[PDB]
Amino acid sequence: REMESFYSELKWQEKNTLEEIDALFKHLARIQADIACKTNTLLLDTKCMDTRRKLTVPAEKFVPQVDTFTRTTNR
Amino acid sequence: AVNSAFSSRCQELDDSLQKLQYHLRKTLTEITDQEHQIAALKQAIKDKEAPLEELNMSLRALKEKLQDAEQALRNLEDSRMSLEKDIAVKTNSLFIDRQKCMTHRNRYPSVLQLAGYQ
Amino acid sequence: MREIVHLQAGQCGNQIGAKFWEVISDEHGIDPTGTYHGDSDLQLERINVYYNEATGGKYVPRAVLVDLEPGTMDSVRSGPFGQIFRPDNFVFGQSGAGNNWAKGHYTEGAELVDSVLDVVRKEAESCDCLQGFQLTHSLGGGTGSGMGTLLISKIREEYPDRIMNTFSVVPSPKVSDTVVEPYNATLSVHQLVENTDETYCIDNEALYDICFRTLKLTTPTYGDLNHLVSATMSGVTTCLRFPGQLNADLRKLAVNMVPFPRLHFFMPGFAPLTSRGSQQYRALTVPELTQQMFDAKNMMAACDPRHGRYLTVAAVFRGRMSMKEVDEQMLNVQNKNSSYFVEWIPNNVKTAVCDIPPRGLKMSATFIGNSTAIQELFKRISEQFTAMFRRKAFLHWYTGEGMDEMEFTEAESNMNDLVSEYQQYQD
Amino acid sequence: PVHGLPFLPGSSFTDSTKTAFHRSQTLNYRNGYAVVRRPTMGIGGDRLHYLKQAPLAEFVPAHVAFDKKVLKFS
Amino acid sequence: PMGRDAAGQVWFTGLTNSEPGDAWYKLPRALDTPYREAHTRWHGCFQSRQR
Amino acid sequence: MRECISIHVGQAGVQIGNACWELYCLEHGIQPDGQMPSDKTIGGGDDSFNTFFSETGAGKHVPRAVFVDLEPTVVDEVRTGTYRQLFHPEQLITGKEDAANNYARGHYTIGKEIVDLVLDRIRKLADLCTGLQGFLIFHSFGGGTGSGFASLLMERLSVDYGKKSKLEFAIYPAPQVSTAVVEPYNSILTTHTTLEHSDCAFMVDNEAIYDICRRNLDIERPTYTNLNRLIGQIVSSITASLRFDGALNVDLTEFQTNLVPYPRIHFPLATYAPVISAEKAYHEQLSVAEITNACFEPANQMVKCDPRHGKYMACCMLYRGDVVPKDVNAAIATIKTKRTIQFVDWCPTGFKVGINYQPPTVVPGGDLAKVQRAVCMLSNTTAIAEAWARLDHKFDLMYAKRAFVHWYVGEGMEEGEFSEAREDLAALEKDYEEVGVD
Amino acid sequence: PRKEYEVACNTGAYTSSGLATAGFRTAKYLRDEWFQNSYARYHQAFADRDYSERQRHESGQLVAETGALAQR
């Protein structure tokens, strides 16, 4: 909940500044970076919340289905 | 002979855990250092942005380096998570054998009473 | 802990300090702004040996800089590192001097010694436990001599337990432009012999000879000269701030080094100087390191130790070495000429080894020696003095200052004592 | 030029195109206090870098906790 | 998966995350019961014989 | 029970300790963390470690030692090494200044304000100590800072404890190698101090360590690492009797009683036979006869002296590993009827034999071989007089020219103590040649 | 490749680890492959760490290069 609320208000403020358009551009920079980090946080959080069902759901049904996007490269 | 073999097994497994944590510490420190330098890299690309052709080509090369550094970081944490899971398994198994077996083995009988008060 | 406060005097000192501080700075790895950069840690932990901490990870010099000529200060201020200095400390004078020795020691310093003393004593209280002071100055230069003899005379009594290292520049044996430079030399040395404890004496001609023999590089800069001497300073001060055995206190060396109170002057030496192409024509091995190390041409301070004999030597080494190669090398050379030494004492070598080298080159070394070869310089100057003082020309300026010749009389026989005593022991 | 190669005492850089040679004056006297400027222009002229209470209880005493409370039954 | 993807996970082998018994307060039989009839009926007959 | 306490002074005494514990952890198998595994030993602190460590309720073994230096560099180094948790922080006592190799400087200028702390620490260990047989002291005759502090604190602890032995293991001056010119000064000062209060002082020299290193270990670039490794193995061998069990046992009390003949002369030598390289041991054979022959080979000793020019007083030999008294006695009889070794007409026997079953162990990544039968050799000889006979005729010269004396006189001492050390040394020699004479 | 070595190792009248052709293999392991698993973990860690530190080195060199180029 609380992360989502923070994210939404951040986007609205950024948008208003956008239609308003030096320090302004600087603040655009800070807001943009903040949005990036917030997205990373929420995605990791959903990833973690996925695996909880393993302790409760009947065995045959469990399959994660969030992020089977295998990212590791070198091998 | 059973006793001796069992002891040797346990000792070897303990040594394995030793090696594992020895690795983990400096692994984490390296991770932190990589993150520091990457943050410095974002700051540096903004610094390079400041004075605004050759410049353009340089900026593109720098951003490519951003990408591969981030890739290295992610591989790092994958290795890390593997290491902790295996740590957990190994420690649990060592508890298992270092508690059940020898404690029940102390109950072993004695030669004279196997001879039946001979 | 153990810490040092650096003193810079005279127009030589102006650029000397610049080169020396930038060398140590980029050694420890500090940006021109002053923010730390962590790549090696031991340097960071031991930076307190010289630097004073400033908030936000900034590291100010513990330098005190003085001259009378303001343009030198302005150039240092404008240099690519001068911003690192602190405006608090630029005590200076209100005119020129004409580098007359009597003026430089008696009239002008009267109103500035107070300020310089207060600044340095504030710094001294701030720090914890001082090994001593190092001064970068000139003995042939006028205003440096005038201020420096005053300050070194002042400080000894308050701090008579402390290592008062003096590092100077000696006039050319061939041509020096400055003409009353002799008289500067005699008056400076007269105090310095009594007052100092250790003094390094180096000359420019051999630097030029080095430029021709090994640099080969046609057109140098006096900045590059200062680099070649800042290497020696970096070396001689390496050992305090770094781990790996070598008992490194300059006093730990000095007691081992000097046999008698009137023997303070020493003759430096550097390690591998590689030519344009010999970099891959040399096998960088300890034997040839020592071979070039102790040579008649690698030496660059005053004159060949050939003319006399050695009392004592001290060699510092920096790099991943072992005992053996250096120890047996010393035995080999000891056998090679067991004659030019003094049967006075055996094993007159001091060796010191530290494991973390400078950067750019893996192995490195620095030499310092006390040998019976100062008589050349001091003879030369003594006959110059007798010849000039014969009809005492140009002494009117000193008469006007209030200088009168009895001070010349008192100094000249002190140098006579120096010459006679040096020759007396070894012969 | 490796832009920061090991600055050995041996070698260093060298430049030739400079013509304008003037020294900036940042030190002067001007009054009782000697005065030192922040230097801005370098050699020749060039750019440098500068509470636990109880919200619902508050411990009301029992007397008030049960004052004037009666149950009425037929 | 055997290939570029792999998850080293641990699946439950269900016997204890279960309510096997029978009674009226259990007969409503909410459809979330993992009640694969094979081993249960096999039990039924097996306890019957073991008795 | 059978426990002792360790002290290190001067910066020569710190690498050697560092190595001694780098080894001593292993034979009981303690990681740099400091915890025996779940194998059932933890409790109040009773098991074979007890002689070395006091592992208390937290499960952390505790070295019974003190490392005092006068310059924070190396002490902070080791405090930043792996074993900082292993050591007790203030057991690592740091000073701030150097002795300048000036013995009197280190003995009067600064010695007055750390002895309190160090002796208080000694008391707060000796309280928990039970057997308190004695102490193992590491200093250096070429003491850069060890000399004066060692003399002063040793005198204080000698007067405070008068009921136990004291062991000193000193790196003796290199006869033709010097990194110090004040070395003869502080060396003879330390000698004429210590000879009356050291109970057993053993010498070792390092040139010969190198000589062995490139004779039989086949390595041509060794260092302190290998030097101190083998030296630590030597002290491990001499403490193995306390460490493990065996057929029969020996102790430092017997070492004193039987090794040293008389009062005063207590300057013996140590020797180790099976220092052999990996390939050299691979396809060769080792046993009692040849190891004894190689040990009494004169050049394998670690002091530049000739026993053939000397005459023998005493010998204690310790065998570690698996042996049998049959071969023991047979071989020692062979040596007894050997010909070059001139035993004095005094002693008909000279051999104190000790055995222990537990073989010596390797260090990980080291240099020595995988040995099964090791042996340590301690000996009283008359051959050592040459070292002092050499030192005296250097010191007399350099003192008749009395260079460097200004340092000492200006810091407080004077020529009288030097003059007295002269005749103390003279008495030493004078006793030695006459006891050597039949 | 591995095929030849597994054939060589598992052929005799002694025991047999069912290292099949393909598909899921037997859960039980043997001492040799167990030690191998450990060594594989260790070398994987070494490779990853060294790669990262290499990257940081040339990154620092590039930063210095570009900064000085711009400062010209």
Ligand SMILES: Nc1nc2c(ncn2[C@@H]2O[C@H](COP(=O)(O)OP(=O)(O)OP(=O)(O)O)[C@@H](O)[C@H]2O)c(=O)[nH]1
């Ligand atoms: N800093 C610097 N010093 C130099 C240079 N070239 C020669 N020197 C020498 O450094 C000497 C010392 O200067 P100072 O210590 O400031 O002496 P001073 O009291 O000002 O007296 P004078 O040297 O007569 O001006 C000069 O006498 C020169 O001989 C150079 O390029 N830079």
Ligand SMILES: Nc1nc2c(ncn2[C@@H]2O[C@H](COP(=O)(O)OP(=O)(O)OP(=O)(O)O)[C@@H](O)[C@H]2O)c(=O)[nH]1
């Ligand atoms: N065993 C051992 N010996 C060393 C070590 N380092 C040096 N030595 C030798 O032992 C002597 C060291 O004594 P000192 O140099 O006086 O050291 P210190 O008294 O602890 O204090 P310093 O004056 O600071 O050196 C030297 O002659 C060295 O050759 C070391 O780390 N371990």
